[PDB]
Write an enzyme that holds these catalytic residues in place. Structure first.
Site, PDB file in Angstrom:
ATOM      1  N   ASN A   1      17.616 -44.767  10.627  1.00  0.00           N
ATOM      2  CA  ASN A   1      18.228 -44.585   9.662  1.00  0.00           C
ATOM      3  C   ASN A   1      18.693 -43.252   9.789  1.00  0.00           C
ATOM      4  OD1 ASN A   1      19.613 -44.036   7.025  1.00  0.00           O
ATOM      5  ND2 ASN A   1      17.623 -43.192   5.882  1.00  0.00           N
ATOM      6  N   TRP A   2      19.962 -43.018  10.150  1.00  0.00           N
ATOM      7  CA  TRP A   2      20.591 -41.098  10.543  1.00  0.00           C
ATOM      8  C   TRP A   2      20.222 -40.434   9.283  1.00  0.00           C
ATOM      9  CZ3 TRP A   2      24.809 -41.077  15.050  1.00  0.00           C
ATOM     10  CH2 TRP A   2      24.078 -41.252  15.690  1.00  0.00           C
ATOM     11  N   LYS A   3      21.125 -40.983   8.054  1.00  0.00           N
ATOM     12  CA  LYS A   3      20.675 -40.885   6.468  1.00  0.00           C
ATOM     13  C   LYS A   3      22.334 -39.745   7.214  1.00  0.00           C
ATOM     14  CE  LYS A   3      15.766 -40.287   6.502  1.00  0.00           C
ATOM     15  NZ  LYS A   3      14.777 -39.382   5.118  1.00  0.00           N
TER      16      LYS A   3
ATOM     17  N   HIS B   1      17.237 -47.280  -0.705  1.00  0.00           N
ATOM     18  CA  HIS B   1      16.079 -45.622  -0.068  1.00  0.00           C
ATOM     19  C   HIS B   1      15.453 -44.423  -1.450  1.00  0.00           C
ATOM     20  CE1 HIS B   1      15.203 -42.384   2.354  1.00  0.00           C
ATOM     21  NE2 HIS B   1      14.923 -43.016   3.359  1.00  0.00           N
TER      22      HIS B   1
ATOM     23  N   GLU C   1       8.269 -47.533   1.903  1.00  0.00           N
ATOM     24  CA  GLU C   1       8.035 -45.915   2.481  1.00  0.00           C
ATOM     25  C   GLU C   1       7.010 -44.784   1.413  1.00  0.00           C
ATOM     26  OE1 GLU C   1      12.446 -43.334   1.302  1.00  0.00           O
ATOM     27  OE2 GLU C   1      12.789 -45.736   0.590  1.00  0.00           O
TER      28      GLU C   1
ATOM     29  N   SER D   1       6.681 -41.786   8.683  1.00  0.00           N
ATOM     30  CA  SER D   1       6.523 -40.795   9.590  1.00  0.00           C
ATOM     31  C   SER D   1       6.798 -41.864  10.619  1.00  0.00           C
ATOM     32  CB  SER D   1       6.525 -39.335   9.460  1.00  0.00           C
TER      33      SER D   1
ATOM     34  N   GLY E   1      13.285 -42.413  10.810  1.00  0.00           N
ATOM     35  CA  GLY E   1      13.900 -41.485  10.446  1.00  0.00           C
ATOM     36  C   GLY E   1      14.986 -40.651  11.471  1.00  0.00           C
ATOM     37  N   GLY E   2      14.117 -38.961  11.637  1.00  0.00           N
ATOM     38  CA  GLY E   2      14.186 -38.428  12.615  1.00  0.00           C
ATOM     39  C   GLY E   2      14.417 -38.484  13.934  1.00  0.00           C
TER      40      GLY E   2
END
EC number: 5.3.1.1
Lengths: 246, 249
Positions: free
Chosen positions: A8-10, A95, A165, A207, A228-229
């Protein structure tokens, strides 16, 4: 259940980031990539360009949201058909960031989920409890309510993926935490959907990093990750995928 | 003030729609486009392909919304830098559909407008009263509060365009009169001059109510109307162009 590592690049990624996508394609060009599925969900502005870059690769593309209608007077909103026609195979729905900052309700996510299936997309539907819902000991009530309200009757293992999440930790969750949330999801989904409930991929959406992926992804009833990141850079993402080397 | 016809496709447009942009560009290759600016605001999914479609041409491209931050943990949101890098020069902010359905406050829109500027975009900032606010006799008071709250202190005549939406008319089958349009636009001009001075006199004020080939001449001749933010009639090149042909001279 075949593993899925979804990124997920957001709200990150423009033309320059496409190199990361190519490197992810390259890294999964071999035996590793034959063992798992991988989908990267990029901003809507980047999707067609990303679809071109990934033409003929194993790596799937997602959007990060879509509307419940095909088209209409909805300035700034993107239909799942638009995502589809631009090259997406998947879309993230519900999300925490949209449930919280955009006030998206379970009912809306349900309507978005049907519309996604109607446009030919796999829905990656997210659920998760907040710190106070957890501190108040309502974690399972909330996950249960989200799952039964966000998912339409027509769920199949092929048209829906669930991501958990732990919004509450936004703390690091323990293996124990992850284990109990995913066992609960699995039992909830089997109760409602029977057989196919056992086949739905449940991704861990807390995470996830190269350093914790082995422990978190080895947990029963975790079928992959919504990263995520760590999905912004091909090296991190690929090292998470490395988990399924065997 | 040089007029601008902007088109808002709303949630309409895919690959197959690109020929319409092509036709609009070609219609505005005449003596026509020397006299007016044109921007089509397309879905974010289509932006880069529409940019490619209009390479070299006078027709600008807009987004239909954008975030207030440059990047970060905002799943499904688009930053004004992504619009810019995909080829947009403009972005619609604060559209009634977003103010109503996405609960966007003046405060949010103000934050979005600053970020749009910092990304190199011209913000098309929308204001407009509802039928309820009109029946409350607060039409002008609402538009005033929206302009003051939605617009940052840094407005220039080059970085900001305002569009007025007569939201009250939506769904009624009636179209605002020249009298309605004049009163709204005269009011917006005075407000913008009080706050921003001479910048405020050169700000483009687009009429964002029902504008179609059939009414364009009268509405766009109204004092302090410097163009239009066209909805449905921007979907087909011939409709958009017939609105534009109002300016032939």
């Amino acid at each position: 259940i075949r593993p899925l590592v979804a990124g997920n690049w957001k709200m990150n990624g423009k033309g320059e980031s496409l190199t990361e996508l190519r490197a992810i394609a390259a890294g999964l060009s071999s035996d590793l990539g034959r063992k798992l599925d991988a989908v990267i969900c990029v901003p809507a502005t980047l999707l067609s360009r990303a679809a071109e870059t990934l033409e003929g690769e194993t790596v799937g593309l997602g959007g990060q949201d879509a509307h419940f209608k095909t088209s209409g007077a909805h300035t700034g909103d993107i239909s799942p058909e638009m995502l589809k026609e631009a090259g997406a195979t998947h879309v993230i729905l519900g999300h925490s960031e949209r449930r919280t900052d955009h006030h998206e309700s379970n009912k809306l996510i349900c309507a978005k989920t049907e519309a996604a299936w109607a446009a030919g997309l796999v829905a990656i539907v997210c659920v998760g409890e907040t710190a106070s819902e957890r501190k108040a000991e309502r974690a399972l009530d909330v996950i249960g309510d989200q799952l039964s309200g966000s998912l339409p009757d027509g769920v199949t293992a092929e048209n829906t993926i669930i991501a958990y999440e732990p919004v509450w930790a936004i703390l690091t969750p323990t293996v124990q935490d992850v284990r109990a949330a995913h066992a609960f999801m699995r039992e909830q989904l089997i109760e409602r959907f029977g057989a196919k409930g056992a086949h739905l991929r449940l991704l861990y959406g807390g995470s996830v990093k190269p350093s914790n992926a082995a422990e978190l992804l080895g947990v029963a009833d975790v079928d992959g990750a919504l990263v995520g990141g760590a999905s912004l850079k091909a090296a991190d993402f690929l090292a998470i995928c490395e988990t399924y080397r065997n």
